[PDB]
Amino acid sequence: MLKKKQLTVLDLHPGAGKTRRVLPEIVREAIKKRLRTVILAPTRVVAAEMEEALRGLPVRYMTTAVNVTHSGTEIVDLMCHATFTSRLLQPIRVPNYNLNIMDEAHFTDPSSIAARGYISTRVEMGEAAAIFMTATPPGTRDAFPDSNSPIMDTEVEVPERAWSSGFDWVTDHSGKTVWFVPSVRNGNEIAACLTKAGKRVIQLSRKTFETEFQKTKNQEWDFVITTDISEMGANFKADRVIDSRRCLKPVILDGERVILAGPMPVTHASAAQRRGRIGRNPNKPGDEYMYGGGCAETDEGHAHWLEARMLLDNIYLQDGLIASLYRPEADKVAAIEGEFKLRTEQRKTFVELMKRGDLPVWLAYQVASAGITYTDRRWCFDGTTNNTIMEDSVPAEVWTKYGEKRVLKPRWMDARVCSDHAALKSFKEFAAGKR
Numbered sequence: 001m002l003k004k005k006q007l008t009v010l011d012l013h014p015g016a017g018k019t020r021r022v023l024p025e026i027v028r029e030a031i032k033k034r035l036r037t038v039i040l041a042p043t044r045v046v047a048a049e050m051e052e053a054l055r056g057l058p059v060r061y062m063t064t065a066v067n068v069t070h071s072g073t074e075i076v077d078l079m080c081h082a083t084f085t086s087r088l089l090q091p092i093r094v095p096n097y098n099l100n101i102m103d104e105a106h107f108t109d110p111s112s113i114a115a116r117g118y119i120s121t122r123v124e125m126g127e128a129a130a131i132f133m134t135a136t137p138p139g140t141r142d143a144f145p146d147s148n149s150p151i152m153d154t155e156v157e158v159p160e161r162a163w164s165s166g167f168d169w170v171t172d173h174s175g176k177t178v179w180f181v182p183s184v185r186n187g188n189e190i191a192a193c194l195t196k197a198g199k200r201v202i203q204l205s206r207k208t209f210e211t212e213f214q215k216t217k218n219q220e221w222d223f224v225i226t227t228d229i230s231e232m233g234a235n236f237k238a239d240r241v242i243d244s245r246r247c248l249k250p251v252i253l254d255g256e257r258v259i260l261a262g263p264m265p266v267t268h269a270s271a272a273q274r275r276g277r278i279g280r281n282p283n284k285p286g287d288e289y290m291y292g293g294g295c296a297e298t299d300e301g302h303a304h305w306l307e308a309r310m311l312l313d314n315i316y317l318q319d320g321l322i323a324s325l326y327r328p329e330a331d332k333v334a335a336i337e338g339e340f341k342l343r344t345e346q347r348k349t350f351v352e353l354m355k356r357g358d359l360p361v362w363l364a365y366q367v368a369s370a371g372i373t374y375t376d377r378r379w380c381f382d383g384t385t386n387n388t389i390m391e392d393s394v395p396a397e398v399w400t401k402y403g404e405k406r407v408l409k410p411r412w413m414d415a416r417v418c419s420d421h422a423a424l425k426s427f428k429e430f431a432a433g434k435r
């Protein structure tokens with residue numbers, strides 16, 4: 001694996017021990033061969049679990065999620081996928097790592113796709129090696145891979161709303177259930193229904209994941225209600241997955257706006273990762289996978305691949321060259337390599353709108369490419385009437401940094417800034433100049 005110009009896909013089935021058994025072997029070999037190595041974890045939760053798997057090996061944990069005193073001598077770095085892409089974008093020295101290891105390399109967030117495109121391009125240039133660790137590499141067509149113990153797969157109608165009758169099998173279960181929902185809002189409704197039926201429910205989503213995931217260890221629970229974030233190496237002591245088989249797809253319409261289309265079917269990779277949460281204990285056969293729809297390749301035309309091109313266009317590689325997407329996922333977008341390359345000051349604004357602004361990549365790009373500066377929030381209020389953001393079925397209002405009450409009406413509408421109460425809260429704070 002460790003020879004230059006090599007990219008290896010380590011595609012052992014879910015729970016085969018890629019993280020706890022194979023990764024420490026790779027890291028030991030890399031240290032023996034004096035390869036400057038990066039390990040990319042999808043989440044702070046996984047970074048902390050990797051520290052346990054690698055404990056004693058000289059690894060620099062480039063995250064506050066890990067409480068360790070470093071030697072200062074480590075040649076192996078661990079950081080999040082997003083941190084890798086972030087440091088590449090910023091005026092910060094990123095070592096030209098000899099060996100690039102991506103764990104949960106199926107992750108479809110824009111910064112993960114961008115990281116794969118950067119790494120795979122360095123490998124194609126002959127500059128580096130890489131190992132992509134995932135049961136479900138891009139384009140996989142198998143939603144039912146092998147497991148540590150047999151799984152009972154059942155196609156069944158799964159509720160996506162509160163129910164009064166017709167789903168007794170959901171609440172009649174005496175074990176622990178992980179339930180994949182298409183959105184935070186849909187999980188909120190199902191969670192309230194289960195809570196009303198006497199169930200103990202934990203909800204996970206991207207924004208809440210580190211805090212709330214700890215509750216799955218610290219308290220007794222009957223259901224975890226989660227979005228697709230729990231596809232990225234989140235482990236549960238559960239005996240059932242309920243899978244809507246549905247997700248939201250951000251879609252750019254007419255180059256002008258982003259909508260959250262669907263819900264619609266997940267990919268085969270996503271379905272296999274959702275299922276893969278159970279069947280993991282070779283001593284506990286008969287874990288259950290209840291699935292409520294088919295799979296489809298909904299990654300095609302998904303905004304994350306275009307957003308990944310916006311990130312890669314603004315990462316220095318060599319002179320004017322630009323990193324390509326990882327070949328197996330490169331057809332998911334129709335973009336011209338370099339079309340999103342910004343001049344120095346607009347690139348800095350783009351980065352800050354993502355990093356401090358917490359804006360979606362697409363929206364950060366519209367603002368930065370318009371020549372607007374980071375603190376100039378006039379664009380949050382001067383859009384078309386149809387870009388009016390609603391709160392409780394009336395136009396949302398903020399006090400501008402000038403002290404004027406104004407309707408939230410962004411010049412560019414990205415549905416991700418108001419897809420749930422927390423997102424809208426954060427975007428109101430942005431529009432008000434509060435960060």
Ligand SMILES: Cc1ccc(CS(N)(=O)=O)cc1F
Pocket residue numbers: 060061062063064070079083
């Ligand atoms: C040991 C260590 C901790 C944190 C960071 C900051 S980062 N890379 O998360 O932006 C760097 C480090 F070198």
